[PDB]
């Protein structure tokens, strides 16, 4: 009905729809929050030892930590 | 007003680890992994007392940390390790899959004489305890105290005296 | 080629200034404007200096001067040196001069300051590791915490748009 | 390290400086020999006309201005 | 008059961009951080008047460390005595990298 | 002062290859101006928009998301409201 | 060393130039059934070095202008910036290794427009000022949508240094993942360079003639250098040299074929072209290349 | 004239002074009063007489080089202790500075040249929005940066703007230039008491809002521009004479009438402070500024002027001219007399 | 003090009296007013680079777009004045006298 | 300006004379200053001499004021010899105003300004002897 007049407003109307609507339904936009937090540009400062921590672990080899293996796994 | 306390030139003198910066960043990560243990002490040290001059012995300590480390790879395994940082080295800036395949040497040669896992992505990272040996300090910031606090105006309020007590139309 | 380059920059700075304050034709104050952007590009290029002088470069010396030169075209003719102006810029290089010259061999010349007379490589930090062209990070960061402020810009700038139409002859 | 190299590094221009100062205006008035400017005792990072201060050309030019017009 | 609708509603549309010492979105500081803390508790509940005549101190040490006033003064007066002593001739200096 | 020492070099050979190519030899519509500030005011909103693969890197980036589709969408709005309302027409 | 870097970079320009004249010649000439200039030497390289030698000897019409210093001052612009607007460009490894150069390219761009502005009015009467105002309006009306496009292209590559740009299409060519943004980047090319299909309907000639072939190829550099480029190895970079080459100069082939065989366009018709079907498609695709990394989970490592 | 590109940029006007009003932060100030001289100048040229394209290129120079000045002063603000907080300032130059801005911005003799030429060629909706919010905008300013303003610049221009609104004001017989002259006068009032109890400045500003909205409301309800208009306007409706007789009294400030209380609380919080020959000197020139007001009503509703006939005519059709909102602003803006107390509403 | 600061402010004092006189033309007056304008804007660049205020680096951009758009207004007025006389000159401008 | 009305009332009355009618010669030609000033800012004297001419003309008009005012109040304070009464400085004001009618060349001008130069500087050394005010308290 409108195709044949101006054809290259509605495309962009259509591909300015899905820009708008399309970045709500997603299974990656945590992924997207969770990778660029991850970066540490600025140096991770430690901490005083004990006000009594059962967690926090001291070799950074030490899987206590909450790390990061979703990354490995694309 | 007061003069400065700079501390002396014969305790101002260690000798460094003069290696050049491309071969220091191609050793960091089994730097960061065995060593640099005792350092997140003189990190620490830095960051609760924002002084230069007080926090300097762990400075040495750090200095004596590497140095020793220097040593004890150069001694042994690896002399490919000369080959990989000379392979990472004239590659611009440093990608490390630049020369993948001769740190795959290197760790390979670390791994079989000498141990040494690689510190994974992202183990470098986590914020993270440590003890020391001096206590916390007070007052970091060098400052008096606060001068005079506000007295503040409490309780229910009876109603106004005399309306206004403007100039007329009392009540 | 020497130390002082960024006073020197702020010397042909005052010179562009004052070679178009005496009023010429304005085909020959856009040139002087030109001129003294240039100048003030290369002024905040030297204290690093990553973006916002190359970004005014684009505004005014790529798209304001344009539109300066595209009314003086369009609106006026100008169609064939005085006193009056060379005049003014001969008092305005000797101003320039004079408070150069009591500058220089002096401590100080104050309008109401107390201007420190050597060269500006103070103050600047100390090599630190900043990593990010602190001015990068800083513009990139008005778009997460700047709500209301592009906002109302963005707002501003649509009422232009309806305001020139409207005044040019709505609709 | 870099920090420690740093802070080493700091430190001995410091006290290169004061002794330096300390020799070079013994003559005249006044002129108390390495009072910091400010109040309150702390370390302060100096401005890099007292790290690299009298000089002389080379060093300073290739340390404050080196690395805003190297490339 | 200064309305408190910034209050009121509660959003800080405003309150970051104010002064330093904000969140800045990489975690550096400014050059004056420690100076401005310590103006800012000394000068916190206090009615701007006894914080303007009791502050003082701080307030001119921030000054001082945002400007580098007489700091710079200092280097230049050290700077022309070392001319006029070098302009006399005694000891062709070996602070620069010599003996 | 390097990239002003390939400015001198660049501008002082054109300036001899002037010299040698001179010294060897020897109303209006309102029409115009609307397209002028149409320019202008565009070109000042690509100026805000410019700076945003500055920021793709933060831990907020629905608001970022979100307000950038804003100032494109008003830009979008102006250029329609132009376009509705015969701004650039003959 | 340095200046010996500048004289390689901006020596064979002329050459460059020149020789790019009698290729567009001799393009033209297969394009039609002509051979020539074959005659004056062997294959006309010469015959272009003899018309510039001729063009440098041929005598002045004397002004007849107003403001003599304006009119040294805008061709001295135009070739000036010709000459310093290959820096950032990189053959294999540019020549200055800058945080950002694709903004300085646009107020490049944006000088030019400056410098036929100032030619334009300080040529001569009325007519020629209106033709010149009118190719300045067409001029400036692209540098919204070719930096537009350029933002949208780089958004996907997330710094501005361009290095990171010639690392980051080693795997498929930009051009798969916008191809009708590069496509309305190339006619916004066009539209920079000035050529036919875009109108055109004084001196030195010589002088505009150089500004305009060296924007051209600077444009088909910047062409080749943003959308695509094969894998660099370093110490044996003449190969990326060679294929650079190649792909640039079999897109000013292109370029120049795309101006052999259509007519010139009404300027309205030119005005209501670029607005009415660029400008909304433009920020689309910008809002769509925005939208897009959030969804693949893929911001550019922004160093 | 669109009715939604009326309505749009009379709420970017509401948008720019609450942007004025609310933000801590000197850039949303100076943002906030550029986009009211942005949406205000198509208020203006709402004909299309070169008049009014005169006055708004003038109001655009003043209004512009007022907006720089500003930001030249805040920029001076953080060349010393930085922040962009809005409060005392650290300079007396960049105090001094930014009330030379806020003067010109204003409306201020020695930057009052702007106004009458400005006034005069406008339609009189135009000139009644650009007045209230012109004069409204810069006082939450000066409310907020109050305690760091050496007195000289603020009573210097007092005291020369109620001067020199008074001794204009006799010779001009034009209506628009008459309210302007008396917008002066009382912006001086306004500003004399600003370093003493903001309270009572902000209250004269909302009592003169008022009262220019009752003004120029009984100026829209016929289109008049002359005196002599105004005889035609007795002729043919009474109750607008009195109206005009009671409201131009009221401007000029009698105790039996609502506008002297803005007078008369000023030298209350002027003369418990010890300055006394600056409010007699102060309240002189109120007695000076109220012969234009009397010879206006002379010319309305006092004395009876010949008429023109087509009044004849006229008589016939109604009075049926839309009044925005006149009854309410009139007995509230002069009967406001015993309502003394409500000073208190305000702080 | 960082003495450039002493040039640029009296830099911005010479385009300030260029604005406030002026005899022939308004597009001059106009012009000293955007050379007033890059004075602002250079001097609160050069500040917000020396100190390192890092997250309010909003003011050198932004106080760029904002007084171009007013710029572009005076342009606007600056037409319709060319349009209503035959010049813009400052003179012929000696209607609606105060 | 400032510091030139605070040498001049830091100067006893008294007579340390002629150092207060220099000082208010000063005074007199800086306000002269001041309304040439505004005159050649608002009038378009064409030429460039004509102005110079009157601004020469007011302010040697003020300066002659200024100097007969504080040469009459030096006599009044030499004969008189009361430092209190302000009968000296209403001859001084109409002194002044007689200048002022004599270099306008007037009678009723100088009659006019005799009666208010003379109630003003009798109202200045009155306020100056009590002690009111400069401008503000500016406190409460
Ligand atoms: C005639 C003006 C009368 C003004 C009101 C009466 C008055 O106080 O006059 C004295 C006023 C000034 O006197 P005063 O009111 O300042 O009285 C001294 C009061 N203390 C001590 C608190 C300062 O006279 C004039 O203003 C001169 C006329
Ligand atoms: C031109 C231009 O933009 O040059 C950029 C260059 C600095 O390079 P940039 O990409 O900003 O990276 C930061 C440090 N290299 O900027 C510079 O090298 C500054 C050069 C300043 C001197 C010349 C000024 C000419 C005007």
Same mark, same amino acid.
């Given at each position: 009905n409108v195709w044949a007049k101006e054809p290259v407003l509605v495309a962009s109307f259509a591909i300015a729809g899905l820009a708008v609507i399309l970045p709500t339904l997603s299974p990656y936009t945590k992924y997207s929050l969770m990778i660029n937090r991850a970066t540490p540009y600025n140096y991770p400062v430690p901490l005083r030892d004990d006000?009594?921590?059962?967690?926090?672990? *001291?070799?950074?080899?030490?899987?206590?930590?909450? *790390?990061?293996?979703?990354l490995k796994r694309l | 007003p007061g003069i400065v306390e700079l501390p002396s030139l014969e305790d101002l003198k260690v000798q460094e680890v003069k290696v050049s910066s491309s071969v220091l960043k191609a050793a960091a990560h089994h730097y960061g992994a065995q060593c640099d243990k005792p350092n997140k002490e003189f990190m620490l040290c830095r960051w609760e007392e924002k002084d230069p001059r007080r926090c300097l012995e762990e400075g040495k300590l750090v200095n004596q940390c590497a140095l020793e480390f220097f040593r004890q790879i150069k001694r042994h395994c690896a002399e490919p390790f000369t080959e990989y940082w000379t392979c990472i080295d004239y590659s611009g800036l440093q990608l490390f899959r630049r020369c993948r395949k001769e740190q795959a040497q290197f760790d390979k040669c670390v791994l079989d004489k000498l141990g040494w896992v690689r510190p994974d992505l992202?183990?470098?990272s986590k914020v993270t305890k440590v003890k020391t040996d001096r206590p916390l300090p007070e007052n970091p910031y060098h400052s008096r105290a606060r001068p005079e606090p506000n007295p503040e105006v409490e309780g229910d309020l009876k109603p106004a005296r005399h309306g206004s007590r403007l100039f007329f139309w009392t009540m | 080629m020497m130390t002082y380059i960024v006073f020197i920059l702020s010397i042909i700075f005052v010179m562009g200034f004052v070679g178009f304050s005496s009023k010429p034709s304005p085909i020959y104050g856009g040139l002087g404007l030109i001129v003294s952007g240039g100048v003030g590009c290369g002024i905040v290029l030297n204290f690093g200096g990553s973006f916002l002088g190359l970004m005014v470069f684009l505004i005014y010396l790529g798209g304001m001067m344009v539109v300066f030169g595209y009314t003086t075209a369009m609106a006026t003719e100008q169609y064939p040196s005085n006193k009056v102006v060379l005049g003014t810029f001969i008092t305005g290089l000797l101003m320039e001069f004079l408070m150069v010259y009591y500058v220089l061999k002096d401590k100080e010349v104050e309008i109401v300051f107390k201007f420190n007379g050597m060269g500006d490589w103070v103050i600047y930090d100390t090599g630190d590791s900043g990593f990010f062209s602190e001015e990068a990070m800083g513009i990139a960061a008005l778009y997460s915490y700047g709500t209301w402020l592009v906002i109302v810009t963005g707002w501003s700038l649509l009422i232009g748009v309806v305001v020139i139409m409207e005044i040019t002859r709505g609709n | 390290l870099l920090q420690a190299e740093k802070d080493r590094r700091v430190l001995q221009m410091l006290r290169e400086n004061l002794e330096e100062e300390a020799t070079i205006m013994?003559?005249?008035?006044?002129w108390k020999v390495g009072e910091s400017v400010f109040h309150t005792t702390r370390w302060v990072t100096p401005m890099m006309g007292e790290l690299y201060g009298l000089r002389t050309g080379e060093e300073i030019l290739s340390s404050t201005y080196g690395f805003i017009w190297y490339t | 008059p200064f309305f408190d609708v910034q209050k009121k509603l509660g959003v800080d549309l405003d309150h970051w961009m104010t002064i330093q010492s904000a969140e800045q979105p990489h975690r550096i500081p400014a050059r004056c951080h420690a100076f401005e803390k310590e103006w800012i508790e000394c000068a916190h509940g206090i009615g701007s008047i006894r914080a303007e005549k009791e502050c003082k101190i701080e307030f001119e040490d921030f000054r001082e460390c945002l400007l580098r006033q007489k700091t710079m003064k200092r280097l230049n007066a050290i700077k022309r005595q070392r001319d006029k002593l070098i302009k006399e001739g005694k000891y062709t200096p070996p602070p620069h990298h010599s003996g | 002062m390097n990239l002003m020492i390939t400015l001198l070099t660049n501008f002082t050979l054109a300036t001899l290859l002037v010299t040698i190519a001179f010294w060897l030899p020897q109303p209006f519509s309102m029409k115009f101006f609307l397209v002028a500030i149409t320019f202008l005011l565009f070109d000042l909103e690509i100026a805000l928009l410019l700076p945003l693969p500055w920021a793709s890197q933060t831990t907020n980036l629905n608001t970022m998301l979100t307000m950038a589709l804003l100032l494109i969408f008003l830009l979008a709005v102006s250029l329609a409201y132009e376009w509705t309302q015969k701004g650039l027409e003959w | 060393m340095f200046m010996i870097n500048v004289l390689t970079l901006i020596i064979p320009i002329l050459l460059a130039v020149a020789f790019l004249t009698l290729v567009e010649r001799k393009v033209l000439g297969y394009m039609q059934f002509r051979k020539g200039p074959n005659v004056v030497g062997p294959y006309g390289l010469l015959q272009p070095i003899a018309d510039a030698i001729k063009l440098f000897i041929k005598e002045p019409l004397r002004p007849a202008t107003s403001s003599i210093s304006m009119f040294i001052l805008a061709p001295i612009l135009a070739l000036t910036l010709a000459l310093t607007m290959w820096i950032p460009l990189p053959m294999p490894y540019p020549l200055i290794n800058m945080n950002l150069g694709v903004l300085f390219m646009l107020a490049m761009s944006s000088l030019a427009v400056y410098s036929i502005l100032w030619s334009g009015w300080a040529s001569n009467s009325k007519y020629a000022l209106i033709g010149a105002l009118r190719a300045v309006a067409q001029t400036i009306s692209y540098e919204v949508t070719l930096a537009i496009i350029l933002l949208s292209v780089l958004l996907m590559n997330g710094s501005f240094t361009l290095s990171t740009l010639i690392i980051t299409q080693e795997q498929v060519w930009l051009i798969f993942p916008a191809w009708p943004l590069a496509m309305m980047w190339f006619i916004s090319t066009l539209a920079e360079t000035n050529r036919a299909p875009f109108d055109l309907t004084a001196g030195p000639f010589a002088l505009f003639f150089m500004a305009e072939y060296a924007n051209i190829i600077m444009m088909n550099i910047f062409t080749t250098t943003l959308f695509l480029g094969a894998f660099h190895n370093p110490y044996m970079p003449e190969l990326y040299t060679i294929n650079f080459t190649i792909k640039s100069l079999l897109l000013s082939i292109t370029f120049l074929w795309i101006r052999a065989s259509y007519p010139r366009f009404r300027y309205d018709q030119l005005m209501h072209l670029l607005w009415k079907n660029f400008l909304p498609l433009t920020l689309a695709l910008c809002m769509w290349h925005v939208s897009l990394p959030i969804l693949l989970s893929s911001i550019p490592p922004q160093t | 004239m669109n009715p939604i590109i009326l309505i749009i940029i009379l709420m970017t006007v509401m948008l720019g002074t609450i942007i004025v009003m609310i933000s801590t932060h000197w850039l949303l100030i100076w943002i906030g009063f550029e986009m009211n001289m942005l949406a205000i100048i198509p208020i203006m040229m709402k004909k299309h007489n070169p008049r009014a394209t005169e006055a708004s290129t003038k109001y655009f120079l003043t209004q512009s080089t007022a907006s720089m000045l500003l930001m030249m002063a805040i920029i001076i603000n953080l060349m010393f202790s930085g922040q962009w907080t809005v409060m005392k300032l650290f300079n007396p130059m960049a105090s001094m500075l930014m009330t030379m801005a806020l003067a010109m911005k204003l409306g201020?003799?020695?930057?009052?040249?702007?106004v009458p030429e400005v006034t005069q060629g406008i339609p009189l909706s135009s000139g009644l929005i650009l007045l209230t919010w012109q004069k409204l905008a810069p006082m939450s300013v000066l409310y907020q940066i109050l305690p760091s303003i050496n007195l000289d610049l603020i009573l210097t221009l007092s005291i020369l703007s109620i001067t020199i609104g008074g001794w204009?004001?006799?010779?001009?017989?034009?209506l628009r230039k008459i309210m302007a002259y008396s917008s002066i006068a009382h912006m001086g009032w306004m500003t004399a008491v600003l370093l003493y109890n903001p309270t009572m400045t902000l209250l004269n500003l909302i009592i003169y809002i008022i009262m220019t909205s009752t003004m120029f409301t009984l100026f829209m309800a016929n289109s008049t521009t002359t005196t002599l208009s105004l005889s035609h306007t007795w002729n043919k409706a009474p109750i607008m004479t009195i109206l005009v007789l009671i409201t131009l009294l009221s401007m000029g400030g009698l105790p039996p009438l609502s506008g002297f209380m803005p007078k008369w609380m000023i030298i209350q919080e002027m003369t418990k402070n010890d300055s006394i020959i600056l409010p007699t000197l102060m309240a002189i020139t109120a007695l000076l500024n109220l012969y234009f007001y009397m010879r206006l009503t002379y010319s309305t509703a006092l004395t009876m002027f010949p008429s023109t006939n087509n009044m004849k005519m006229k008589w016939q059709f109604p009075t049926t001219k839309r009044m925005t909102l006149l009854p309410t602003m009139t007995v509230l803006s002069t009967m406001l007399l015993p309502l003394t107390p409500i000073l208190s509403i305000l702080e | 003090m960082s003495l450039v600061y002493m040039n640029i402010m009296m830099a911005f004092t010479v385009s300030l009296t260029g604005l406030l006189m002026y005899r022939s033309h308004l597009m001059s007056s106009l012009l000293c007013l955007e050379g007033m304008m890059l004075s602002l804007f250079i001097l609160a660049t050069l500040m917000i680079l020396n100190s390192h205020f890092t997250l309010a680096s909003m003011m050198p951009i932004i106080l760029l777009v904002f007084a171009a758009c007013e710029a572009a207004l005076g342009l606007s007025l600056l037409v319709m004045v060319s349009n209503t006389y035959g010049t813009d000159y400052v003179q012929n401008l000696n209607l609606l006298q105060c | 300006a400032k510091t030139l009305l605070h040498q001049y009332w830091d100067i006893p009355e008294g007579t340390e004379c002629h150092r207060k009618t220099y000082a208010a010669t000063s005074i007199g030609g800086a306000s002269g200053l001041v309304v040439s000033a505004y005159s050649v800012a608002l009038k378009t004297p064409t030429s460039f001499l004509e102005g110079v001419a009157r601004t020469g003309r007011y302010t040697f008009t003020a300066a002659a004021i200024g100097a007969i005012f504080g040469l009459t109040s030096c006599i009044s304070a030499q004969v008189r010899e009361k430092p209190d009464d302000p009968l000296n400085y209403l001859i001084g004001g109409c002194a002044g105003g007689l200048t002022l009618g004599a270099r306008t060349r007037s009678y009723g001008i100088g009659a006019a300004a005799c009666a208010y130069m003379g109630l003003t500087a009798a109202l200045v050394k009155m306020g100056q002897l009590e002690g009111w005010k400069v401008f503000a308290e500016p406190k409460v």
């Open positions: 006000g009594n921590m059962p967690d926090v672990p *001291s070799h950074p080899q030490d899987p206590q930590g909450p *790390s990061l293996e979703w | 992202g183990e470098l | - | 013994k003559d005249v008035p006044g | - | - | - | 201020m003799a020695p930057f009052h040249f702007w204009g004001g006799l010779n001009q017989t034009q | - | -």
